[PDB]
Amino acid sequence: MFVARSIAADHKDLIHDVSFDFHGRRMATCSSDQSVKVWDKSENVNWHCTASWKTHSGSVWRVTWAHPEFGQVLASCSFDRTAAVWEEIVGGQSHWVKRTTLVDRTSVTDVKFAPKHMGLMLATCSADGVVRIYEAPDVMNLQWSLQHEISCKLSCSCISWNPSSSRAHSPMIAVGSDDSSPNIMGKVQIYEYNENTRKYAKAETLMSVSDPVHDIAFAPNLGRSFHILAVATKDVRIFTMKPLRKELSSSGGVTKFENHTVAQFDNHNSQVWRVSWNITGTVLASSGDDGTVRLWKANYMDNWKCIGVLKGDGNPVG
Amino acid sequence: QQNRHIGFSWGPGDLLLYETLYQKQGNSETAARCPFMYLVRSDEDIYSPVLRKLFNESHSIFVGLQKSAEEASGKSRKAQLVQVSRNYRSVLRACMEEMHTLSESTRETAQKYISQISILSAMELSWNLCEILFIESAPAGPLLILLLEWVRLHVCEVDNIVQDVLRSEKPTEHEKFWDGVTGYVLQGRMNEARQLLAKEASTSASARSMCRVLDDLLKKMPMLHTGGTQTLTEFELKWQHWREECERHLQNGTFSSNVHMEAVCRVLLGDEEVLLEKRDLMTTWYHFLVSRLLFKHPTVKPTELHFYAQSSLDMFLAGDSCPEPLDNILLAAFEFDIHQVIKEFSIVSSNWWFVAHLTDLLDHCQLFQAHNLYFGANMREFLLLDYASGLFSHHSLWQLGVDYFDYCPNLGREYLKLHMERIPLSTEKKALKALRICEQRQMTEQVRSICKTMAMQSLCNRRLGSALSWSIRAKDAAFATLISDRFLKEYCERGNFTDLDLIDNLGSAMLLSDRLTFLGKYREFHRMYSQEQFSEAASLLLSLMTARIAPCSFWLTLLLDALPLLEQKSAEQTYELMRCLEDRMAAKLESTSPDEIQKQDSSIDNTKVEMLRLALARNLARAIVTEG
Amino acid sequence: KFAAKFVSHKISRTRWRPVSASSLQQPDVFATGSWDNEENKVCVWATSDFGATSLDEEYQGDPKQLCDIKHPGDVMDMQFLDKERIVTGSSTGTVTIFRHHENNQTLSVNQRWEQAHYHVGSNMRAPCTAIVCSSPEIVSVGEDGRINCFRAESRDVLRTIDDADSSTMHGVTFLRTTEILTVNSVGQLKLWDLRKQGNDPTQIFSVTGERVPLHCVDRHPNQQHVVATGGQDGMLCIWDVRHGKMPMSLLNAHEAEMWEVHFHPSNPDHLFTCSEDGSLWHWDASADSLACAWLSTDPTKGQLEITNLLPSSTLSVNSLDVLGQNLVCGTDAEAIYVTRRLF
Amino acid sequence: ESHEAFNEWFKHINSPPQKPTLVGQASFTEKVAHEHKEKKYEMDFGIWKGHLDALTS
Amino acid sequence: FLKNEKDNALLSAIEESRKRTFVMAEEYHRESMLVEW
Amino acid sequence: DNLSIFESYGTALMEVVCRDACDGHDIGRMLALALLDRIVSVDRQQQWLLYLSNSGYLKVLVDSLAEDDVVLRNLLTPQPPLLKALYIYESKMAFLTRVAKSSQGAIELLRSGVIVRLAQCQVYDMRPAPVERYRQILLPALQICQLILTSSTAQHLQAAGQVLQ
């Protein structure tokens, strides 16, 4: 019996995105009006606009929060070919201050902070088919150093860090490929950090994702011996990735992978545009051209099913 | 709306939903405003105050059970489990009663309150059916006594009818009088039926002779007793002989002048047509089942119950009425299909409470196949993990979910770590509670996260003492150095330390970082200076400068202090100080920028150095004289 | 001995309504504050049905809620100022006086100080961690290290001691009419004279070598120099504030954080303590019977009798209050426990 | 009583506080920990000596 | 002959059960004879 | 003197040994029942017998006899899965036979409904080595009954009524 309560946003232009902070006490919204707004949740469960500023002169494609250990930090990326880092400089005098602009050749299609145990790192991807990884050398001085350039050889549309804090797994990034490519398949690529070469190397290519990829999400690993990846294309796909075996005598490779499609769902009825896991990785949300958000969950027999569908008027489908 | 794409964002237990736009650019005629806030929440009835009370009381019950699961064997243990089951059902009762008073006093929530009373009725109904069966598992004989008690505890309409009849000035002339007599017979309540018949025996002489025969038949009716030495075969023979006595009285036309006494005698024979004519007194097919068992099959075996249950449902529902979801649950229980009982209740119930606690209790009865599901955990751990995860969504109940996760080490420790790091720490009291919970369960990284978060919150609030205390608890040497440097900004500026008493009491915590070490040792030097231990203060300063624990600007500061110290009215010690001065100067020539190199104190430093050289020379001569 | 009432909110604070010293009436009304919910409240409760004149019926009476009011933030601390007025400290840094209207069974906001506690420079609200009342005077302490003095009829703060502590203060009590004691996150008990024009404490007491947070402080009712404190280590410390800077006694009381300590107001040979470990202990110093029994340094003179009053396996007991034969306490188990026959 | 007092005294005289020893390559944190151990030893020795003189009397 | 000793242990256990049966059966026969007398 | 030592421990040693004799496992149960059989025989005071009755262990041992109907049905087979069950049954029947030799024991057994429970057992109606085995079942059951009642007191005449049943 989910209940939705409308608020009068009164946005100058429609906001193309909303992002919660890590604690779900704050949200950021962004719009065609060239602004970002920040909203704080009162004790009475009401939202109040606490900051509003003009951010750019280009289509803000993505917004992301840093981990709260680095303070109140936002990153945004744009059609203007830049990513920007913002810090909430409060006195009640909040005024999200631009700390840097990353300027290294085409639209920056996605931006994601790395898992906190890797430090204050930011990945960007661009339609030039490059992923760039920056590091802030001082968390108190939000200067950024370009650490890595990863040539994907396909237009990058989206990126996901593997959130696994296990020291048994090298840092991993999934990347997509929007290119319609009548033929080229492999539109999801996986990169692994190689300690011996101090470089990201291509570990995997999901050859079954011959369709254009719109979004990708690694599931929270929560002690599994295998990774789970959701992929948004013309359908919703779920992959399990099992790392292969090993010998302590010597090792310098990407440790090849066994990949299985465990689910494929065409029930979207339109090019599924977004996929998002809940905080436990037990429920998937998807959105598509059918004007619905769908909720997916496995039962105790690992059988995934839909568990909810919505309407244009805002009512949940009976 | 106007073919708009849905954006979503997962919160810690909430789903944020919004209209993104169109991925089309400014387009689409259909015009309006996207002022819609959509928080989709999983779960709903948990918010009830009474249900929360139930949950607290039963967490107490669960903890008790777990702790006592090591102490008792066979029969004693079985009885203890039965009593735990009864306690759960009593909590259900209290909750229903409270909800009912609430509905009575409040008209607007009474619709919903009655819906929830019916929900709890569902819960107690299923819990108790399952209990009785698996946990008691009574053999042929006691089974029917318990089923008569079961119908009596859940079907109260006959007692209301009889109370209304008894409130009338003339109970025997009341329209429902014979319905009260027949209802007591249908429930096996022969003594209460006889008390009503004794009133009718007063009305007429012809009624009195028939009432005496019927009273004697009801009095002689064989009943099973929980403790008799009587065998089921000796009971069956007495029951057959009593039934032949009833049949003989009917065949002799003994009751032909009173249709109601004849109908009661036909009920005593188990006449199915007359039992079905009295459906409105039984109200349910399962009351009809138990009345059929009483008058046709009093020695029924557990293994035969399903056949009679199905036959009773089919006969009772023999019109346009479809079985209710409760009927499927009760039939599955009479079939002894525990998995089907759990499945049907999982479909009908909004809440996992019934299926979680009934399955937990039935697992303690050693019934389910004893193996893990599909992830190194069993039906019990899976359902407890999902229920506990549900409690973590709620701002006050997440603390209860912690203890449920402790139940299974494999299936609740990693979830507990993940959730403990996500708790909104708004107050020091809440953080201290979370820390106590983690420390008991050995979770270091989670506690480090807690402490660092608290200390950064303190850096934002400008509470330097609280921030330092939290950084020390974090062992956080990096954050320790950060706060030491903030105090250094403050002292480079004011000429005095804030919070003197804390720095003076650092003790062994001073060793957490070299920067903190320097800070504390320098504060000790100032303390020596206030105590006129001038030599001691100066030597401490010199040692700090030579160890280079001091940051390369405190070199100037400490060097000027050495300046007046030297200025006052062994040779090796004098040479040492000279070496320290020269090292400082070489460092300056290299590290210090040309801009900072050009400052005022140079000439003052040179005069201090000349005074030191003169004192050392004379001091060395004095030392040589002492050696002589 | 205890009636338990489940209330669908965690209870941070419980206090008895003060009885007039001339009244033969037993305490019957108490207040509660809630915490760790989206909507917190102050509630008033009665233990007796207004009308039972039988001296001979076993008290099986569940406490009945008389009235409530929404409280912004988490009720961090709560005290009665008098019979009609309840003071609260909020996690929002607000100090509020509520008035209880007994005739109508309602609470109303009488007065508030919305900027009682805040960090200097950011103007960010800081939690008000403890309060103490001596009608008409109110003192509050907070995470901002401030000591505020109010008078119930004054809209303005009468006195602030800015930067009184560089650490969070957790507890405050009156030593005398113009003197208070505070406890903090670095294990210090600090004595203050509220007439002294400076911001320095008059005296500082601490356990030597250890910086264990102190959460609670209470003063012996008849002996103005005897003080009890509780810490994060579950230790009960007894102090003579005239003798040295160290406690006179260190007693192993709890397995986790000690939230409250109270001397019995009329029989101070009894003391009560509650903890995060879920326990509620009664301490009796009368068992050997003017040397305060609590200040006995002779382990052979004054056997303290110690009794756990609650069942094993309660969640955190966040607050207790004791008046005459009556004790109330509040827990994280969404429960209020009440006894009317302590002894 | 004289034999009991002597045995209490004899137990106490044979349990003197241990003087802290500095290991010859101690870190800065270990030197601060040693000064804290030495101050603790002087205090513990003062208490032990006061108790010894009372038991001796 | 360690295995023989193990077998002997099993044999001794069987002998103990047999002695128990010998005693109780003899007692029952004696009781029946006493009742007849 | 041995009995004084058994008592001296208290109802604690008696409870642990009697509980374990009931529902331990195979060998241990058999040996524990044998031990109980032997201790109750030298029980002139009959304290052990009183403890067994008051603590409910005697009732549990009697109720557990209904367990063997399925065992007997499986056993009437040409090949027997395990003779262990037969030995437990023997030790158990031996112990019960020993308890029945006592004038009081016979009364306590009658109060506990031993004849009623034997009358409910269908194994006695399955007359077929298998024939020898039916024979032996009959032996123990009827044993206990007859011996008991006979050596039973004159006041407990119903004994005759229950046996006739």
Numbering used by the authors:
A (entry chain D): 1 to 91, 99 to 111, 113 to 150, 152 to 327
B (entry chain B): 18 to 586, 591 to 649
C (entry chain C): 4 to 292, 321 to 374
D (entry chain M): 746 to 802
E (entry chain O): 101 to 137
F (entry chain A): 1464 to 1591, 1610 to 1646
Article sentences:
Nuclear pore complex (NPC) constitutes the only regular route of cargo transport between the cytoplasm and the nucleus. Here we present single-particle cryo-EM structure of the nuclear ring (NR) subunit from Xenopus laevis NPC at an average resolution of 5.6 Å.
In our structure, the N-terminal β-propeller of inner ELYS stacks against the N-terminal β-propeller of inner Nup160; the α-helical domain of inner ELYS aligns with the α-helical domain of inner Nup160, orienting the AT-hook domain into the nucleoplasm. Through close interactions with Nup160 and Nup37, ELYS becomes an integral component of the long arm of the Y complex in the NR subunit. Nup93 connects the stems of inner and outer Y complexes within the same NR subunit, and places its N-terminal extended helix into the axial groove of Nup205 from the neighboring subunit.
